[PDB]
Amino acid sequence: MNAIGNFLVGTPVFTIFICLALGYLLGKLKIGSFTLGATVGVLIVALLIGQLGVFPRDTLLGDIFFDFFMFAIGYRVGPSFISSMKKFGAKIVYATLIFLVSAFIVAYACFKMFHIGPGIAAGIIAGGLTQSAVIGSSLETISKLPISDHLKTLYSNQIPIVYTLTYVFGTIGVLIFLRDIMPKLMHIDLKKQAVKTAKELDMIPVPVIVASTHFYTINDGSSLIGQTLGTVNTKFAKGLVAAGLNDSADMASVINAGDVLAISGGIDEIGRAVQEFNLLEVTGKTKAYVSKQVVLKKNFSADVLKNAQDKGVLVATLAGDVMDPAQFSTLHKPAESVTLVGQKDAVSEVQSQLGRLRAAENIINYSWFALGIALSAALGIVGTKVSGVPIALGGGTASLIVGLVQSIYRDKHAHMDTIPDSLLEFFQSIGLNLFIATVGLSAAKTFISAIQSMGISVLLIGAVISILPHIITFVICYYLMKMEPISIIGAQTGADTLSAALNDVSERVGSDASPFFAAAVAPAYAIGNIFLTLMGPIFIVLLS
Amino acid sequence: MNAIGNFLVGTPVFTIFICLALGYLLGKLKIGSFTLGATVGVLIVALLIGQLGVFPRDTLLGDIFFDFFMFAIGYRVGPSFISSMKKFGAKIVYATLIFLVSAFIVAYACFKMFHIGPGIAAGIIAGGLTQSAVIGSSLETISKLPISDHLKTLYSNQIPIVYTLTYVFGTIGVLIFLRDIMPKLMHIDLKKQAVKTAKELDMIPVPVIVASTHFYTINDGSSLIGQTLGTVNTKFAKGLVAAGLNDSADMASVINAGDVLAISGGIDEIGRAVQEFNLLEVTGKTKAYVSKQVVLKKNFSADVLKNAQDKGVLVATLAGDVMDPAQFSTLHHKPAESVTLVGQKDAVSEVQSQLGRLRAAENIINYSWFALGIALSAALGIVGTKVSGVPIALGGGTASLIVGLVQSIYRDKHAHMDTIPDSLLEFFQSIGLNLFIATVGLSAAKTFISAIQSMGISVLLIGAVISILPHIITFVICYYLMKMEPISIIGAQTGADTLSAALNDVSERVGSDASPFFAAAVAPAYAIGNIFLTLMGPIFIVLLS
Numbered sequence A: 001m002n003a004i005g006n007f008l009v010g011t012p013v014f015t016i017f018i019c020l021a022l023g024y025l026l027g028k029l030k031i032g033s034f035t036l037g038a039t040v041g042v043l044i045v046a047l048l049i050g051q052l053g054v055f056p057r058d059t060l061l062g063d064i065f066f067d068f069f070m071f072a073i074g075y076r077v078g079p080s081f082i083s084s085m086k087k088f089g090a091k092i093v094y095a096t097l098i099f100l101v102s103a104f105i106v107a108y109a110c111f112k113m114f115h116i117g118p119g120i121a122a123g124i125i126a127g128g129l130t131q132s133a134v135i136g137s138s139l140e141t142i143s144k145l146p147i148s149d150h151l152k153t154l155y156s157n158q159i160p161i162v163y164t165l166t167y168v169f170g171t172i173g174v175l176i177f178l179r180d181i182m183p184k185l186m187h188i189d190l191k192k193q194a195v196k197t198a199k200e201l202d203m204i205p206v207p208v209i210v211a212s213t214h215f216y217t218i219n220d221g222s223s224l225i226g227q228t229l230g231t232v233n234t235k236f237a238k239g240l241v242a243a244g245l246n247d248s249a250d251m252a253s254v255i256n257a258g259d260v261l262a263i264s265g266g267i268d269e270i271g272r273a274v275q276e277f278n279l280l281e282v283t284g285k286t287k288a289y290v291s292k293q294v295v296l297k298k299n300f301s302a303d304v305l306k307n308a309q310d311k312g313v314l315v316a317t318l319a320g321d322v323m324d325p326a327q328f329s330t331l332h333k334p335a336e337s338v339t340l341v342g343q344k345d346a347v348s349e350v351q352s353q354l355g356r357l358r359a360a361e362n363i364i365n366y367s368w369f370a371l372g373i374a375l376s377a378a379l380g381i382v383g384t385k386v387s388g389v390p391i392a393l394g395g396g397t398a399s400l401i402v403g404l405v406q407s408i409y410r411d412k413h414a415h416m417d418t419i420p421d422s423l424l425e426f427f428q429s430i431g432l433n434l435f436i437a438t439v440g441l442s443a444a445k446t447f448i449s450a451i452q453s454m455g456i457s458v459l460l461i462g463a464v465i466s467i468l469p470h471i472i473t474f475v476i477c478y479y480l481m482k483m484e485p486i487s488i489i490g491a492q493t494g495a496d497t498l499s500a501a502l503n504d505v506s507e508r509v510g511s512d513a514s515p516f517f518a519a520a521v522a523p524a525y526a527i528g529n530i531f532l533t534l535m536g537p538i539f540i541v542l543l544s
Numbered sequence B: 001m002n003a004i005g006n007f008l009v010g011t012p013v014f015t016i017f018i019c020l021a022l023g024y025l026l027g028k029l030k031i032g033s034f035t036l037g038a039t040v041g042v043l044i045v046a047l048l049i050g051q052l053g054v055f056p057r058d059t060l061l062g063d064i065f066f067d068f069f070m071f072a073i074g075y076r077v078g079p080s081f082i083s084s085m086k087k088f089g090a091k092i093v094y095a096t097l098i099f100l101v102s103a104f105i106v107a108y109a110c111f112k113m114f115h116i117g118p119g120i121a122a123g124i125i126a127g128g129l130t131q132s133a134v135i136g137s138s139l140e141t142i143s144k145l146p147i148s149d150h151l152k153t154l155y156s157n158q159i160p161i162v163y164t165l166t167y168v169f170g171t172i173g174v175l176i177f178l179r180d181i182m183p184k185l186m187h188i189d190l191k192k193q194a195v196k197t198a199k200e201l202d203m204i205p206v207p208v209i210v211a212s213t214h215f216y217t218i219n220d221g222s223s224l225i226g227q228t229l230g231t232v233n234t235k236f237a238k239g240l241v242a243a244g245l246n247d248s249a250d251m252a253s254v255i256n257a258g259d260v261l262a263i264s265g266g267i268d269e270i271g272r273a274v275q276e277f278n279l280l281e282v283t284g285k286t287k288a289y290v291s292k293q294v295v296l297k298k299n300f301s302a303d304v305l306k307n308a309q310d311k312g313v314l315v316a317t318l319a320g321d322v323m324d325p326a327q328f329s330t331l332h333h334k335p336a337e338s339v340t341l342v343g344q345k346d347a348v349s350e351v352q353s354q355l356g357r358l359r360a361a362e363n364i365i366n367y368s369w370f371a372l373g374i375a376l377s378a379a380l381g382i383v384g385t386k387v388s389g390v391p392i393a394l395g396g397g398t399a400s401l402i403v404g405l406v407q408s409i410y411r412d413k414h415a416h417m418d419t420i421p422d423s424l425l426e427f428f429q430s431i432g433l434n435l436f437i438a439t440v441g442l443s444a445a446k447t448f449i450s451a452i453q454s455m456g457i458s459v460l461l462i463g464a465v466i467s468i469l470p471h472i473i474t475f476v477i478c479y480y481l482m483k484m485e486p487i488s489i490i491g492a493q494t495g496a497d498t499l500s501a502a503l504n505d506v507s508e509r510v511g512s513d514a515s516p517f518f519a520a521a522v523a524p525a526y527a528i529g530n531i532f533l534t535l536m537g538p539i540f541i542v543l544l545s
């Protein structure tokens, strides 16, 4: 009855990580309410369970996990940002700026009209524009600005409760407004329109064949038996290479009654080469003929690539596609990693002539990741004072920038790693929920009193500030400027900085147009994050 | 100069995560010193950087990350534990018990002889026998036991420093002793001996072909043109199934001049089927013919599996191997087990609907399960009992390891939850322990120089002897008297001692072929060692108090 409170206060790990299971269950619960969402479910469960005791909030854990989340988001968005900036015009930047200006004006007007205190204003902003990074900067600015200590403590205490109150709407709505209402008003279907636009533009992924080795076995009949590999290779068209007899790299050899040929190349070419000059196919069993990806070191050597086919090694791109002869004339001063296949040690000989091996594709140099996080934390402290306002970049924004720059600084020097794609997902699906659960648990004891005292006056203001700017930008961009349909959704979801909408829309659209949607949304994210984070302290200073 | 201290104190994230990069760099550094190790490098860098200020230690972060590490280790070791218990005899348990008894006796004798205080004893145990979950239980027992408050605080303060002092040896040595010295003394080569033993036993992995679909194209000549698929399939031997013409499941059809056949099955069978009745090969381009893995729901239906081949869908195991006809008779009696279906786009779904629903996506993790596991482990930790006035509790890390083991074992028998990625446990168990160690080293750095000046050589040598001698004793007793197999000696004494760095290094050296065998040889000892070595701290505190 009452000892449960003591137990919960005494086992913080149990409390936090039981706030994370029921939350996900509730979020996945579907009762015709268009689901709820994992974050909202976690918040609700944390609020409900916080009533059984008093749990203080730990800053370091939340900061670390939020930093992980921001870094993962930045790394995921990195590669598409450059492509979108290259192809898409400045329309995305224009839409983001329009949205931010509209939100600023609307928030200022509403707060001035309703005579809202600076703390309530900051909380409503952070909980309506769904930007959790505000809280830290707002608290720092409150501490810095000179006012009475009672006011300082009151403002510091009043933020999280209104933040929690407004977040529920800021996430449950807006998502529906720009996922169903906007398509209904625009009389288009997400799938069809996105596919059409992607086909019109050059963004649809192009599947590529992967060249490999097939261990054929020679027939026991009579067809060019007892012959060297060099003449056979010369007879073969381009894109086919022999790989010895059993495991040997000797180029003279002697074909006997029974032995594998171990052809290498594409698929259609080997199909033709087996239809003509018939040969049997077998699974084969040998550890040789391993493939590798190797960077170059000898200043785009030409003759080595020219004679690799004679040597018995096939050269292909990183994706594993037979390269064109012209590619051998020049690559890209120095060159990049290429894929070699044939033989066991001949491939290594060609590699030694060329540069060293490439990233294993599944090993992560933890030094790089840890240094990135630490450098982001350090960069956060950098800041400047404008009109007595100590504005700083913050932590989450710095981590996002570091992720973007680090991702862009890859595949140009493919010598570090390829972080697994099954880790960023966990990071960006766990860190934010953990931070939200911590905040909700902390700001739960006084939630009922806060809602009783400050009631309807707050929720409606939060809803209007969350919704109206989206409608304004939608009308201005659709009826006046008349941009393409899907790009409107692509923006207004990065400027608003909400990831649930991003994930849901990507899943609905599908793989075909998923890269296109990612490109349409990437450029807005960084600008929105920076400006929306800076918009908190400015409001505090103005309304103080 | 001095503002750096203020900056470091004011940016804990920067401090901790700069203690994690230079540490890994140092660990990878090789100057002929047999490397150093990531954990030791992190500890050294943390000790060096802690001198510039005063940083208190946060318990919750360390507890969470250590729990993640323990859970990952348990999940990784789960599947092999049952297999080793099934095949390997109780020799592993006997060796672990011998090691634990020897370590207990040696530690007790040394401490009694040298008149060492309970706090120093607990710290030396923890920094020797490398179990790091001791500290929490030891602190809890110190708080519980009734003594003067000054003694309580002194004992609480004195643990981490000696722990850090002894951990360096406990990790750098022992590893070398049982990775190079023991093979040299036993006159065997790790690779050759492990391969020989694995070949003798039934543990070497067996590669399995993966059946799939090939989109052949019919020749424009004259060979059985204009024929139905049913007669073609009946003519074809077992293991080959047609998949329509372009995307259709109609079984009457009409073969025209140009259209793909879309055969499905193994590789050798299709090779034979293309040498006889020659057909061209093309890459093809279609989204149909997708493969799926589906659990069963209709109580091991027989006729459906019998007629699936006629329907045009090939049934295979989870690994993707054509099943034997006899397998269709019984299967496995309850409605369970998932099988792989390949042919066609919607016919596969029809067969699935006749059978049970789909299986785990193999790349999506129900975070609810993981979070509930962690929370349940934390709760289970609190459970404990008092023996002779000693409140012994299972602790947190041990509970997490047990939960990981049980959860892993409770999978593939009900393959309806997930298959956690294998690129996440590695990160967990390579980051959590190092983060915890960095935090502890940063906290216990200000007074390290004074502690070494006051309590000096008397501690390091005792730690080294307690870390080394039990291994030698068990080695001799098991090799010269009992005469067990060579590699199993290394397999034990590294789980009872709980030395994950040695585990990983030996696995890498041995290679993939005998890696499962080594994992089996080491798994059963880990749990017993963890539990008993964790309980051995409070007992020592009570005895020597």
Ligand SMILES: N[C@@H](CC(=O)O)C(=O)O
Residues within 6 Å of the ligand: A130, A131, A132, A133, A432, A497, A498, A499, A500
């Ligand atoms: N930046 C966060 C916003 C928040 O969680 O407050 C997001 O994208 O979801």
Ligand SMILES: N[C@@H](CC(=O)O)C(=O)O
Residues within 6 Å of the ligand: B130, B131, B132, B133, B433, B498, B499, B500, B501
């Ligand atoms: N159980 C841990 C002990 C430690 O190193 O802290 C291990 O095997 O590594």
